[PDB]
Curated annotation (Swiss-Prot), chain B:
Widely expressed. Expressed in colon, brain, heart, kidney, liver, lung, ovary, pancreas, placenta, prostate, skeletal muscle, small intestine, spleen and testis. Not detected in thymus and peripheral blood leukocytes. Gene3D superfamilies: Barrier-to-autointegration factor, BAF. This is Barrier-to-autointegration factor. Changing residue 46 to E: Abolishes homodimerization, preventing ability to cross-bridge DNA. Abolished ability to mediate nuclear membrane reformation at the end of mitosis. Abolished ability to outcompete CGAS for DNA-binding, leading to innate immune activation. InterPro entries: BAF, BAF_prot, BAF_sf. Ser-3 is the major site of phosphorylation as compared to Thr-1 and Thr-2. Phosphorylation on Thr-1; Thr-2 and Ser-3 disrupts its ability to bind DNA and reduces its ability to bind LEM domain-containing proteins. Non phosphorylated BAF seems to enhance binding between EMD and LMNA. Dephosphorylated by protein phosphatase 2A (PP2A) following interaction with ANKLE2/LEM4 during mitotic exit, leading to mitotic nuclear envelope reassembly. (Microbial infection) Phosphorylated by poxvirus B1 kinase (VPK1) on serine and threonine residues, leading to BANF1 relocalization to the cytoplasm, loss of dimerization and impaired DNA binding activity. The modification N-acetylthreonine is found at residue 1. The modification (Microbial infection) Phosphothreonine is found at residues 1-2. Homodimer. Heterodimerizes with BANF2. Interacts with ANKLE2/LEM4, leading to decreased phosphorylation by VRK1 and promoting dephosphorylation by protein phosphatase 2A (PP2A). Binds non-specifically to double-stranded DNA, and is found as a hexamer or dodecamer upon DNA binding. Binds to LEM domain-containing nuclear proteins such as LEMD3/MAN1, TMPO/LAP2 and EMD (emerin). Interacts with ANKLE1 (via LEM domain); the interaction may favor BANF1 dimerization. Interacts with CRX and LMNA (lamin-A). Binds linker histone H1.1 and core histones H3. Interacts with LEMD2 (via LEM domain). GO terms for biological process: chromatin organization; chromosome organization; DNA integration; mitotic nuclear membrane reassembly; negative regulation of cGAS/STING signaling pathway; negative regulation of innate immune response; negative regulation of protein ADP-ribosylation; negative regulation of type I interferon production. It comes from Homo sapiens. GO terms for cellular component: chromatin; condensed chromosome; cytoplasm; cytosol; nuclear envelope; nucleoplasm; nucleus. Keywords: Acetylation, Chromosome, Cytoplasm, Disease variant, DNA-binding, Host-virus interaction, Nucleus, Osteoporosis, Phosphoprotein.
């Protein structure tokens, strides 16, 4: 297992009302910036991932533009949402 | 009350179901959703979630996007709301 424990916690169960900082890659700095843009709960970021048809390039670019995520952070967040979807959607 | 199409949708994960599997989304609406990129049910779920599950704004967006009338948008909203309560 190469993922963070944090990723594994997220993908292990439905996300319900979890905050955006429960997503892998989304530390407190990125999470504050996402919340200030209206992306307060993880499911709102899931929504964007889904409206972008789960496209890695568009989602990671959107995350960079919206909260300044770097490549590792956007990869981790994408991978967490992708694996969550594979398990639960 | 509810249609069987609604109950069938809310009973299980949606996976790669087409947009027409959503309650209220018939052939005409599905066509116009697909023309706009919303070809699978999960893409419309995505919009529902980005709008924070807000009934008024989601139903208005659906009317604006594909021409859904009030019953169609009611049906579609309700199926996504109940799916989310069961699976999200």
């Amino acid at each position: 297992m190469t993922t963070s424990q944090k990723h594994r916690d997220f993908v292990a169960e439905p996300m319900g009302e979890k905050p955006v900082g429960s997503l892998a890659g989304i530390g407190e700095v990125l999470g504050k910036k996402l919340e200030e843009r209206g992306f307060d709960k993880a499911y709102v970021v899931l929504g964007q991932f889904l409206v972008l048809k789960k496209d890695e390039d568009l989602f990671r670019e959107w995350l960079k533009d919206t909260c300044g995520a770097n490549a590792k952070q956007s990869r981790d967040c994408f991978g967490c949402l992708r694996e969550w979807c594979d398990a639960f959607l």
